[PDB]
């Protein structure tokens, strides 16, 4: 198939202790502009970092000077890390991500329900994060008295949002929750007749 | 740093004592997969991605070696300064709208985790059937967060964390 490649952690030459290393790729306009930043962290304090803008390692605390100075010297390491912007970032965006993260689209489920009252529009289980959720009253956009959660991250590659409108139900009125999202050909509109 | 997407690749975390490590990939905030360091198996968050891409778990193992190594050296370099603990915060919320007589998933979201060892449990009595924990996630400030999942049959629940940077365990009720 197509394969994910990870960076190569550079090596160096009760009470507890923690090491962490990460490779961050920053894509803007697809792969039109990539930034590559790789970080070495000891006990929550970042101490070394490469950054493709600088083009070379730098020490971020004085624990880091040994390694940043060392890795900068030996070109089999520095050239390799510089080239990880393509061998890792560009390769992964263009390859596996295009077949997975960038192709994923799950549309949301919308349900309205009463809770001077307040209706709640529950919009769940969607991806990616872009979504617009508007209320209409009898066909007029209601922006006063409407309040939404922030985007809530479910951890399983799905989001949810809940939009509460403050209302008073007079027998005959129609309130419609209106949801636009990249996964829907036409918007979703769910009505609640009073 | 501004961008449309961010892939956070090759996240290696090692901690001693205990010899505890973790190797994960993430995209846009979401875990693509981790490497199981005992079964030496790449396990994907969504099986569907495992059917559409791959990652050789061995590149995780080697990287954990490096990071074990580095951890040994820096431990000594700083004259063995130890890790300083943190107070974690939990927030409990449901996956779908709750409907009694209908199965639902209940999510516990712990944050400000450091170091990355917590016990995340849950009637007034412990419950172990049908829980999925996530792996540790990366925060801009190098503490971690993690979500636990309990499957409930909504009727008519609390989330218990035991960390070290918490003097007595913290229970966030629902």
């Amino acid at each position, epitope marked *: 198939r197509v*394969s994910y490649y990870g960076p*190569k952690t550079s090596p160096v030459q009760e009470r507890h202790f923690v090491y962490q290393f990460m490779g961050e790729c920053y894509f803007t306009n697809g792969t039109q502009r990539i930034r590559y930043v790789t970080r070495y962290i000891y006990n929550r304090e970042e101490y070394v970092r490469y950054d493709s803008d600088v083009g070379e390692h730098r020490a971020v605390t004085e624990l880091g000077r040994p390694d940043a100075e060392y890795w900068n010297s030996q070109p089999e390491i520095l050239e390799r890390t510089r080239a990880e912007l393509d061998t890792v970032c560009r*390769h992964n965006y263009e390859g596996p991500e295009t077949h997975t993260s960038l192709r994923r689209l799950e549309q949301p489920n919308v349900v309205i329900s009463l809770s001077h009252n307040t209706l709640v529009c529950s919009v769940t289980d969607f991806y990616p994060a872009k979504i617009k959720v508007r209320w209409f009253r009898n066909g007029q956009e209601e922006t006063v008295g409407v309040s939404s959660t922030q985007l809530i991250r479910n951890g399983d590659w799905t989001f949810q949002v809940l939009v509460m409108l403050e209302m008073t139900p007079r027998r005959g009125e129609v309130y419609t929750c209106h949801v636009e999202h990249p996964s829907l050909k036409s918007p979703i509109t769910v009505e609640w007749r009073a | 740093i501004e961008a449309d997407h961010v892939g956070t690749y090759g996240i290696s975390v090692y901690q001693s004592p205990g010899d505890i490590g973790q190797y994960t990939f993430e995209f846009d905030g979401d875990e693509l997969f981790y490497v199981d360091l005992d079964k030496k198996e790449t396990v994907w968050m969504l099986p569907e991605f495992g059917q559409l891409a791959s990652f050789d778990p*061995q590149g*995780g193992l080697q990287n954990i*070696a490096v990071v074990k190594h580095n951890l040994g050296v820096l431990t000594k370099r700083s004259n063995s300064t130890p890790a300083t603990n943190e107070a974690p915060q939990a927030t409990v919320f449901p996956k779908s709208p709750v409907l009694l007589g209908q199965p639902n998933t209940l999510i516990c979201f712990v944050d400000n985790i450091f170091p990355p060892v917590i016990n995340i449990t849950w009637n007034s009595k412990s419950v172990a059937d049908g829980v999925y924990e996530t792996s540790f996630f990366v925060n801009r400030d190098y503490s971690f967060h993690k979500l636990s999942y309990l499957t409930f049959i909504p009727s008519d629940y609390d989330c218990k964390v035991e960390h070290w940077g918490l003097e007595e365990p913290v229970l966030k009720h629902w």
Partner: T-cell receptor
Amino acid sequence: QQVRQSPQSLTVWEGETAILNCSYENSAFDYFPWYQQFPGEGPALLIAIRSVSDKKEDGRFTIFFNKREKKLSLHITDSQPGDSATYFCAASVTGANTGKLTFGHGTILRVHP
Amino acid sequence: AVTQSPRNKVAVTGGKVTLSCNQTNNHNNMYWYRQDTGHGLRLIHYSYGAGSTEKGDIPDGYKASRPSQENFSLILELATPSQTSVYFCASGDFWGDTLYFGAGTRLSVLE
């Protein structure tokens, strides 16, 4: 992913040029090192090429790489009888960070004095 | 330097053999290969550091052990005729372009 070397035995008179050929199947191979094994010892690195590279010179030994045809050749010029050895072609996908190298079955080169 | 012990060993089916390999380049990865005509150089087991151990391409019939950064051992609990061969040990750095081999050990396992 199998690496396939030809011929199995090559015999040459001193001064000739030996041609040892190697081909692979996995398109992801990007590092190709040749290991020389003398009788009774174990192999040592002779000379290596990366995929971004068209040719690699080193004294009397040269590697010719062809990415499109997935083909690879070691030339030994001015064949000394001391070059009599088994020569192995290898390849790794360096991006997979795995550390394992895939090995040809090697060609036995006997140089005649 | 990379040295293996023993360099030659005779053994009978059912016995337990132990090849041992020591290395002094402060290398982190260690490997155990096997060489036979018609089969080239096959990987049996290897290791990225002390305590860990990976199954190469033909791990059946052997178990390996890396107690120390400098030490990698290769054990045949029930030796078989088919395990008659010439065994090579190696090492390398993290992300190393070079493997560094030992001088080999001839082993015959006979009925």
